[PDB]
Structures are given as structure tokens and as C-alpha cells.
Design an enzyme around this catalytic site. Sequence first.
Site, PDB file in Angstrom:
ATOM      1  N   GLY A   1       0.777  -1.224   0.000  1.00 15.80           N
ATOM      2  CA  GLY A   1       0.000   0.000   0.000  1.00 15.80           C
ATOM      3  C   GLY A   1       0.814   1.281   0.000  1.00 15.80           C
ATOM      4  N   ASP A   2       2.059   1.235   0.456  1.00 13.14           N
ATOM      5  CA  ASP A   2       2.906   2.424   0.526  1.00 13.14           C
ATOM      6  C   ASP A   2       4.351   2.028   0.259  1.00 13.14           C
ATOM      7  OD1 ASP A   2       3.724   5.070   0.887  1.00 13.14           O
ATOM      8  OD2 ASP A   2       3.720   4.936   3.076  1.00 13.14           O
TER       9      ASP A   2
END
Length: 293
Positions: free
Chosen positions: A192-193
Site C-alpha cells: 500500500g505504501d
Amino acid sequence: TIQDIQSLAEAHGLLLTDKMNFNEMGIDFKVVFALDTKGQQWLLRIPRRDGMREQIKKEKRILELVKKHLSVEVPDWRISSTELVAYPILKDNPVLNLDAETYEIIWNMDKDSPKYITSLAKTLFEIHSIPEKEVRENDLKIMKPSDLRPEIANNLQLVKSEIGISEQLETRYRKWLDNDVLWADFTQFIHGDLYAGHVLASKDGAVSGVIDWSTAHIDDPAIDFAGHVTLFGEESLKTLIIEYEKLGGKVWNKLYEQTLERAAASPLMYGLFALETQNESLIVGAKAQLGVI
Ligand SMILES: [Ca+2]
Ligand SMILES: [Ca+2]
Ligand SMILES: [Mg+2]
């Protein structure tokens, strides 16, 4: 005090010497570099104010889930809450970090490293293979493929109405949303990041760890490729995708093209984050990234 922190660690099971160094670069946390009585180095995170409770709860569940399925290390949160987060220092430094004074990108690794490509591809494969059933059991967000575009459309509306957006960025994002063939018909568990500042590696480039897991959920797998192309360029992204597919990574015809749109959508995602991390500092810097000013 240092004594106050020593008491907390003791109150949660960990015996620390009275030698600590503090770091202030963090937005949500203050960082303490500690040392236990046997000589092991530790990292402490103390959230500044109220707010961080559900993120710290969630991230601990994510870390315990992902370590089961990853052949590289992730932080072992032996103490976890808004009073105190503590884990032993991991084995390697990030492949890059951002100098705190200037944000100059300082690289701890040769960019061309063949080993970074093959080990990052294997790590991507491992993350994206985590079963949906287990993600469900840990109560994490699950995006279905048919929810991806309406989500972004909602994000676009909200960021436009409050922060604002350059006309050229808006037309590109709408073109993106209109381009059916770019969007995968499946979703998978993603970090996600993910970009090189959240990947730990030896100087030869071999990935040994992955950090900052609080955003992990089921979503578009191209999200986990966007950070690479931004820093490493289009040609490196193609080699990564090829190594990924070689391992059994689930791909589609336009994964490369979708990854470029994801990377270009970075201003939109940061404007979205800045609206729920309320600072004049953040919405102003988000405003510039969106082509206003
Ligand atoms: Ca493991
Ligand atoms: Ca269309
Ligand atoms: Mg653990």
C-alpha cells in the site's frame, strides 16, 4: 523522561539502559533509539498526541499476518500501543532515505543492482500471495475490482472540491478512469505504501526487510509498483514486471501502463491523505503537487 520511558518498557516487559537518543523528524511519532541491558539496539515510537490508536492496533495485526508469509524481515512489535511502540532494530538500512533538512534523496544502494530487481520481485510475489481469507480474518480493507474506479472517482471529487486540482491533472485522471483495458479484473493483498525508502537491503541490493505496513489491504496490485517506476524509471519497471511474472506473479496486459497512471496519481493520493492529516503544512504542499500555485 528517560526514566519514564524505562519504566514503560519495564511495565511492558523490556529492560532498557538509561542511554537514549531522540529524533524529531517524525510527523505522528517521536523516535527513541534505545539499548537493552543485554546490548541489543531497539527502536521506540511514541505517538505525539491522541489519534493513533486504531492505526497502531491495525498495524500490529498486519505485521503479525505478513511475517507468516514473507521470507524477509518485518518489524517485530514486542510492545504495541499509543503509550509506546518498541521493536529491535532491523538488520539493514533502507535502500534510500530522505535527508531531514532538505529532502535530498540519499541512496544507500546502487540503483542498477540486479539483485534488487530479483529480490524485490520475490517479495512482491510473497506479499501479493497472502490469502484473502486471512486478510478478511484480520479485518482489513478489501477493495473488489469493480469498486476501484468509483473509489478513485469519489477521491477525485473530494480532493477537487476542497484542495483543488490543475486542469491537466484532472483530465489525465479522468482519461485514466475511462480506459477500461488498464484495470485488472482481480485485486490482491498489497503493501500500500511501497517504495525504496520502505525497503531494507544490503549494499548489493538484496532485500532483507520491508517496513511501514500500516496501509496494507487488498487493492490494485499496480499500487505496489508505482513507487519503483517513480524512482527507478520506465525501463527498470519493465524488468521488475518480467521477474515478477517469472515467479508466478499475476499480471495483465496493461500492468505497466496502469503502473504509470498510478505513479501519476500520486498527487491525488497525497491530497487525500492531507485532508485527514490536518495541517496547513500538508494541504499547502499537497496543493503544489496538484498543479495549483
Ligand atoms: Ca517469515
Ligand atoms: Ca471507457
Ligand atoms: Mg511479530
